[PDB]
C-alpha cells in the first residue's frame, strides 16, 4: 500500500513548527489541530502518510488569466498530493475541480483590530478613509469580497483592490503584524478560527470585533475520482459524533489560552 | 419527469398557509423549506411536487427489524426522489442515503419554560424533580443513545426508562409539554427550533446553556441519484450568494 501524500499549510494552530523540529523527521516535526486531524483520519481509515507543505505557501486560487490553480488546491488538481487536511474553505469554484468531506470546523470571515480601535462593524470599515484594510491573498476572504453583491461588501471591495500601497497580505502571520504595528491604522479580515485563536496569544493586543460576515466550513479535499473520497467523508462524522473534533478545537484554542 | 420532495411539517420550515383548505398542491405550503426547495429547483432545472412524509417522523432505523421509518425510509425505498428538510447529517444516516453539504448548523440545546431552575446540562442530570426527553425516531434521541460522555449518559439512562414516557412524537407536542408543565418538564431539541420558539407568543420560553453539539442540516438523495451533485453545487451557490442568510432572516427574526 502506498504513502498518501498529505499537502498541508502552516498556519496556527492548525500545522506549527514543534519547538525540536530541527533535531526531529518526517510527520514529528509538526504539531496543531490538523496533525492531529490527520493522525485521526489516518486511522480510522487505514492508511499511512506524509505531511507535506504546500510549496507556494498558499490555500489556492485559480488566476483568471492563465486559469491556473495554485495552493494546496493546485497540488490535488495537478496530482503533486493525495488529500489536502488543513483548514481549507469549502466553496463552490473548489467543489468543481476537487471534492470535499462535510465540514470538520465551521467559521465566518470577521474583523480583527488593534484594540481601542474606533471600528464595530463592517459598515463602519466602509463608511471611513482613516483605517486601511485587507485580507489574505489567494484564498476564500478575498473571493468572497470579489464577489459579493451585498452593498458594504461591494463598497469594501472597490477599496480594497485600488487601495495603495497594497491591503492584501501574504500570511495570516503577516496580517497579524500589519495590525499590531499600525496603531490602529489597518484592520484584517480574517477567518473568525484564525481570528479567535490570536486574540488568546500574548501580546493580547488584537480583538475581533462584529458579527461573522457569512457562515461556511472547512472540509478535507481529494482530486476528483479518489478512493479515499467516500472514507474519509465517514471518518469525519464518526469523529465528529464522538466528539473528537470538539476536543481538538478546546485542546488547540483554549487550553492554549494565554489571555486570561 | 416531476421530482418528488419529501419533507415535515416543522415550524419554520414548512407550515400550512392559512386558507390552504381550498389550495392544491405546493401552494398549501409556505416555509424555510418550501423556499430553498423553490431555489434548489430553480438552479438545477427540475419540476417538483411536495408531499409531506407520510408517518410525520424524521428517520431511524428500528433495532430489531434494521427497517428506516421517516424520511430516510421514504428515500431508502424510493417512495421519494429527494428530501427538503431540517434533516441532519449524521453517520448511520450517511451510510445509506447521500446529504449534500450543510444548508444550515445546529446543535442540541434545552427549552425551559421561563424561570425554570435549569442553566445546563448537568443540571438536568443531578435532579429529579423536573423531568425531560427527545423527540422520537430523531437524531437527538440517538444521540443521547450512543453518547460516552458522563453527563449525556446519565441522562440517556433516566429517559429511557421514565415512566410515563418523556419522548414526543412531534417537536410541537414537545414544546407544548414544557409550556402545561408548570416548569417540571424541559425538553432537548435543536438550536435552530428552540430559537423560533422563543421569539413566538406566548414568550414563556427559553434557550439554556451552550449547544451540546455541532452539525448541520443537510439535502438528502438516495444513492445513485443524478440529482446528489447537481445539488451540492446549488446548495454552495445559495451559501455564497447570501441566499441562505436571507431566508433564515426572513423566518426567524421577521416577544
Ligand atoms: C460533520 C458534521 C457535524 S456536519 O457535516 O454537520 N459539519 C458541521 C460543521 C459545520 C461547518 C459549517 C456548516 C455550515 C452551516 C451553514 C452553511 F451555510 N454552511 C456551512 C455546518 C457544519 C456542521
Ligand atoms: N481558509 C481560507 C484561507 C483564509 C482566508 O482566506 O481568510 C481558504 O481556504 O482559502
Ligand atoms: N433534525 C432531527 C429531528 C429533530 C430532533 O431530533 O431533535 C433529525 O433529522 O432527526
Redesign the interface.
Not at 464577489?147 to 451585498?150: C, E, G, L, V, Y
Given at each position: 500500500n502506498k504513502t498518501v501524500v498529505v499537502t498541508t499549510i502552516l498556519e496556527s494552530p492548525y500545522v506549527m513548527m514543534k519547538k525540536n523540529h530541527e533535531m526531529l523527521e518526517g510527520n514529528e516535526r509538526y504539531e496543531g489541530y490538523c496533525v492531529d486531524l490527520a493522525a485521526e483520519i489516518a486511522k480510522h481509515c487505514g492508511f499511512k502518510y506524509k505531511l507535506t507543505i504546500v510549496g507556494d505557501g498558499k490555500y489556492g486560487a485559480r488566476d483568471a488569466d492563465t486559469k491556473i490553480w495554485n495552493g494546496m488546491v493546485g497540488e490535488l488538481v495537478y496530482g503533486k498530493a493525495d488529500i489536502a487536511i488543513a483548514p481549507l474553505t469549502?466553496?463552490?469554484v473548489r467543489?468543481?475541480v476537487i471534492d470535499?468531506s462535510?465540514?470538520f470546523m465551521?467559521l465566518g470571515i470577521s474583523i480583527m483590530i488593534k484594540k481601542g480601535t474606533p471600528i464595530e462593524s463592517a459598515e463602519d470599515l466602509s463608511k471611513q478613509t482613516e483605517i486601511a484594510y485587507g485580507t489574505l491573498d489567494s484564498g476564500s476572504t478575498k473571493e468572497?469580497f470579489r464577489?459579493?453583491?451585498?452593498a458594504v461588501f461591494d463598497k469594501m471591495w472597490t477599496y480594497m483592490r485600488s487601495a495603495e500601497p497594497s491591503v492584501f497580505v501574504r500570511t495570516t502571520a503577516e496580517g497579524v503584524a500589519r495590525v499590531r504595528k499600525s496603531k490602529g491604522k489597518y484592520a484584517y479580515l480574517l477567518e473568525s478560527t484564525m481570528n479567535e485563536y490570536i486574540e488568546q496569544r500574548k501580546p493580547c493586543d488584537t480583538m475581533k470585533v462584529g458579527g461573522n460576515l457569512?457562515?461556511?466550513?472547512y472540509?478535507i479535499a481529494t482530486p476528483k475520482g479518489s478512493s479515499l473520497r467516500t472514507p474519509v467523508?465517514?471518518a469525519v462524522?464518526?469523529l465528529?459524533?464522538?466528539?473528537v473534533?470538539?476536543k481538538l478545537k478546546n485542546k488547540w484554542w483554549y487550553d492554549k489560552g494565554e489571555c486570561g
Open positions: 469549502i466553496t463552490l467543489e468543481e470535499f462535510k465540514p465551521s468572497f464577489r459579493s453583491k451585498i457569512d457562515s461556511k466550513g472540509g467523508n465517514l462524522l464518526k465528529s459524533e464522538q466528539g473534533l470538539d
